[PDB]
DNA sequence: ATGCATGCATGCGCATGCATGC
DNA sequence: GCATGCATGCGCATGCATGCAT
């Protein structure tokens with residue numbers, strides 16, 4: 001056992017004597033918190049490591065008590081750093097000022113939240129390995145979010161007004177369900193024995209945002225022959241609206257039970273998210289098949305792009321799709337009928353909190369403003385193909401069935417892989433790439449040497465131009481996507497001609513050709529993407545020439 | 559479902575036999591089945607397996623092998639499948655129409671108790687790092703083959719139903735047994751007509767074997783001798799007419815024969831222990847074998863102008879090079895070593911030569 | 921001390937999705 | 943190319959058992 005007063009004093013002096021970062025960060029944070037210019041404060045346990053490390057272990061063992069102690073210490077320290085009144089004060093601030101002008105619960109007057117960030121020395125755990133030994137401790141978990149609930153208010157402190165007196169009664173809430181009061185415990189009513197009845201007030205009461213979310217284990221950490229396990233996380237305060245379904249997240253929190261069996265849950269404190277044509281250096285050749293993927297990732301200025309690759313088996317189309325899925329920030333990958341029907345579009349499901357029905361989207365909905373990858377496209381069902389066509393042409397999905405009447409926005413770019421032409425793919429897709437294989441001794445020897453080098457050294461063969469990591473590519477793409485070039489008026493007189501003659505050539509080759517305004521739109525989109533790659537405000541001729549060359553190369557694949 | 563002092567026996571046997579280890583293990587695979595040495599070698603390679611490789615970019619390279627056997631009836635294919643089922647630690651039999659795509663692949667069921675959606679594992683999901691045997695493979699529907707394609711390619715299963723989505727590991731190996739479309743293998747017709755399967759499915763398979771019931775009098779005499787010797791056998795310690803660990807097995811007058819006294823078969827338990835120890839080992843490829851394998855792959859691809867009158871059972875793609883490397887790695891695992899040698903690649907090359915080409919009779 | 925709301929099957933009615941047979 | 947057989951989720955009401963808040 002140990003007295004909490006000494007540790008409270010230690011926390012108070014720590015919050016005031018951490019200049020070793022040169023600006024006094026905590027002084028500024030307290031000033032902003034006192035002037036209502038900041039509503040959240042995070043404490044680093046790595047910062048506490050400079051002080052006595054016993055506090056770190058104590059916090060890791062009894063996190064809630066020390067969180068309350070930190071909150072109390074910050075509340076006591078706030079008056080010292082105050083300099084001025086609130087510039088713009090809201091309804092709650094008006095109530096606080098009026099109450100101070102005229103005991104009150106500490107959380108009622110409090111208007112800030114405190115959270116702990118896990119130490120870097122603390123190794124993250126696994127959802128499967130958190131058990132009774134970790135109950136009440138501070139843990140860090142890495143996982144994937146699958147379900148998120150809507151934001152709703154939750155009571156913190158309830159305020160009651162009496163029928164025959166101006167006294168206000170305050171009731172803290174520490175349970176999922178609470179019993180409202182009836183009689184007035186005020187001293188005036190107690191003396192007079194009037195027996196007045198209390199009435200709840202929504203304005204005086206304090207509310208906080210509340211959210212539910214679910215997390216699952218990564219497929220890498222699953223043991224042999226097992227199935228990933230799920231955990232439930234509660235979100236409150238400013239941490240709300242951070243996590244979204246389909247994201248890989250890391251959450252630091254506390255493991256607590258619910259009432260001799262009990263059910264466990266997690267309370268979140270910190271949630272965090274986890275030439276340039278060098279896509280998949282592991283694959284030899286396909287030099288002209290990689291710039292198209294880069295342009296697809298960059299996108300146009302609707303400016304979406306859809307790409308389909310048809311090829312004989314064994315040319316490794318799937319690896320390119322997997323690399324594209326891994327590289328893109330928001331991406332989804334589909335293999336076939338394992339995610340057909342309900343896997344796409346959306347479905348109606350019960351709520352965890354409200355107890356009513358809400359709509360949860362599929363792969364296409366999750367991939368909104370991202371890139372979707374489809375493998376074995378020819379094997380998909382008719383309904384899925386119609387939905388994909390609707391997404392490609394209209395960018396919205398329309399659902400009208402029993403209990404569902406919705407229009408979902410899906411602004412996603414589709415990359416598809418297929419085996420061996422039907423007119424639908426040519427008329428709908430912007431770019432089709434047909435990959436054919438033929439035996440050549442020199443090319444076979446080169447490919448075999450590259451494959452053997454990859455298998456032996458576990459790394460692609462070195463060359464004059466070294467490739468780049470995924471983080472640098474992502475940052476470069478993010479920087480490139482910022483700008484929006486414009487097509488000059490004069491170049492029209494060029495581009496139109498470049499179109500017309502082309503169609504004339506297509507009219508000469510009556511065997512099998514397809515041209516329309518869609519080809520011109522695709523050329524314009526590719527030219528705009530190429531101009532964006534150069535950060536130029538005005539599209540140049542070289543971008544148009546490169547786009548025309550790429551389109552011709554796509555067309556010349558028989 | 560390990561001993562202590564058998565490590566000395568394993569070390570002595572390895573350091574003594576070296577090269578003969580693989581031949582002896584292949585020979586003693588199944589005494590009850592006569593002949594089919596290449597099939598036994600391929601089964602031993604499946605038991606040993608390849609090496610899984612993971613790289614910095616997160617790319618995955620398959621390390622499992624797949625073999626498909628096609629032939630006339632009564633050539634002991636189901637017996638081999640049953641023996642593999644008995645010997646393999648995680649072996650699962652799934653016939654053609656016995657299980658559908660929902661049974662082979664994990665599914666999603668909505669729990670009525672809590673309102674949530676849970677995943678129920680399929681047949682292939684349970685058999686992680688194991689063997690799945692499929693008899694009557696021809697009777698299987700196309701959709702099941704499409705579902706199995708993902709597992710055969712990357713050994714993973716992607717599932718998604720609104721509110722839940724997951725990817726499960728399916729790193730397994732497959733044995734398949736199928737019958738010809740005409741019931742019996744027609745000698746005159748090309749293998750493409752007899753097999754009657756799409757090119758992608760055959761390409762995703764690693765090895766194709768064709769077995770024929772040639773009615774040669776000497777072969778028939780030997781087969782009858784072996785079959786009746788096995789049938790006349792009775793276990794020692796059991797009274798006649800009743801109703802119902804050394805490295806080398808004790809010689810038997812009926813199970814082995816008087817002529818076979820010069821050689822001995824390896825015991826089942828010692829074989830299992832040695833297979834496990836070999837599977838533990840992680841070999842490394844050398845530079846000498848890489849150029850040889852590449853040149854032989856180029857020769858195999860250019861053999862289209864040197865095929866003579868013989869036909870090819872399966873198309874030659876980039877996966878054939880990986881199959882060569884995987885078979886070489888398995889043969890290197892067969893004998894406890896550290897590096898890949900020339901004979902190691904030569905054995906795999908011989909296996910590919912035997913498997914890939916067949917003569918056509920007029 | 922007593923009557924009632926709830927947990928746990930089970931029938932009812934329905935729509936929806938997957939397979940196939942003419 | 944489509945209607946139907948065979949699961950399966952959805953939403954609901956109804957009946958049998960029991961456990962205790964007013």
Ligand SMILES: Nc1ncnc2c1ncn2[C@@H]1O[C@H](COP(=O)(O)OP(=O)(O)O)[C@@H](O)[C@H]1O
Nearest residue numbers: 282283284313314315316317318319711876877
């Ligand atoms: N150009 C290439 N360079 C390197 N490896 C290749 C190449 N083409 C094919 N491969 C190899 O062949 C295998 C093809 O398998 P997969 O990607 O499933 O083919 P597909 O995607 O066409 O079905 C891959 O594992 C890959 O390592």
Ligand SMILES: Nc1ncnc2c1ncn2[C@@H]1O[C@H](COP(=O)(O)OP(=O)(O)O)[C@@H](O)[C@H]1O
Nearest residue numbers: 590591592593630631632633634635636637785
């Ligand atoms: N080479 C052989 N040596 C010993 N027995 C054999 C051989 N070939 C066939 N047999 C016998 O004939 C039977 C063949 O049945 P089965 O293995 O079901 O044939 P398949 O698998 O080709 O349908 C087996 O019971 C086996 O005992």
Ligand SMILES: [Mg+2]
Nearest residue numbers: 316317318711
């Ligand atoms: Mg593929």
Ligand SMILES: [Mg+2]
Nearest residue numbers: 632635636637
């Ligand atoms: Mg059989």
Ligand SMILES: [Zn+2]
Nearest residue numbers: 162165184189
């Ligand atoms: Zn009162």
